[PDB]
Design an enzyme around this catalytic site. Structure first.
Site, PDB file in Angstrom:
ATOM      1  N   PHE A  32       0.885  -1.188   0.189  1.00 41.47           N
ATOM      2  CA  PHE A  32       0.071  -0.165   0.010  1.00 41.47           C
ATOM      3  C   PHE A  32       0.760   1.340   0.071  1.00 41.47           C
ATOM      4  CE2 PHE A  32      -4.468  -0.756   0.225  1.00 41.47           C
ATOM      5  CZ  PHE A  32      -4.764  -1.949   0.783  1.00 41.47           C
ATOM      6  N   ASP A  33       0.324   2.156  -0.846  1.00 41.47           N
ATOM      7  CA  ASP A  33       0.864   3.598  -0.748  1.00 41.47           C
ATOM      8  C   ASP A  33      -0.205   4.471  -0.461  1.00 41.47           C
ATOM      9  OD1 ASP A  33      -0.661   3.899  -2.969  1.00 41.47           O
ATOM     10  OD2 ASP A  33       1.188   4.010  -4.383  1.00 41.47           O
ATOM     11  N   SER A  34       0.113   5.680  -0.197  1.00 41.72           N
ATOM     12  CA  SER A  34      -0.555   6.609   0.234  1.00 41.72           C
ATOM     13  C   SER A  34      -1.971   6.716  -0.467  1.00 41.72           C
ATOM     14  CB  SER A  34      -0.284   8.086   0.335  1.00 41.72           C
ATOM     15  OG  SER A  34       0.172   8.494  -0.679  1.00 41.72           O
ATOM     16  N   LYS A  36      -3.339   4.273  -2.405  1.00 37.44           N
ATOM     17  CA  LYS A  36      -3.980   3.090  -2.204  1.00 37.44           C
ATOM     18  C   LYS A  36      -4.842   3.022  -0.840  1.00 37.44           C
ATOM     19  CE  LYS A  36      -1.452   0.799  -5.640  1.00 37.44           C
ATOM     20  NZ  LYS A  36      -0.498  -0.453  -6.396  1.00 37.44           N
TER      21      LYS A  36
END
Length: 74
Positions: A32-34, A36
């Protein structure tokens, strides 16, 4: 059940069929990134007709934390 649905949403967002478990770190393990993570919070709010505070969203680190954030509504 609730958990299976959350896993499916996680899988849809990440486009993976990998198994999802409560110990997985959203960033370190699942990638996950910001963006997602924003998708995850908002998708779940819409899916479950719930609201998650920014503060609680901030503090979510693992898949399990996601389960308990939704579980409080049920």
């Amino acid at each position: 059940a609730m958990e299976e649905a959350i896993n499916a949403t996680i899988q849809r967002i990440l486009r993976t069929d990998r198994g999802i478990t409560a110990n997985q770190v959203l960033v370190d393990d699942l990638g996950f990134d910001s963006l997602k993570l924003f998708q995850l919070i908002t998708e779940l709010e819409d899916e479950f007709d719930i609201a998650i505070s920014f503060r609680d969203a901030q503090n979510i680190k693992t898949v399990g934390d996601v389960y308990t954030s939704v579980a409080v509504w049920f």
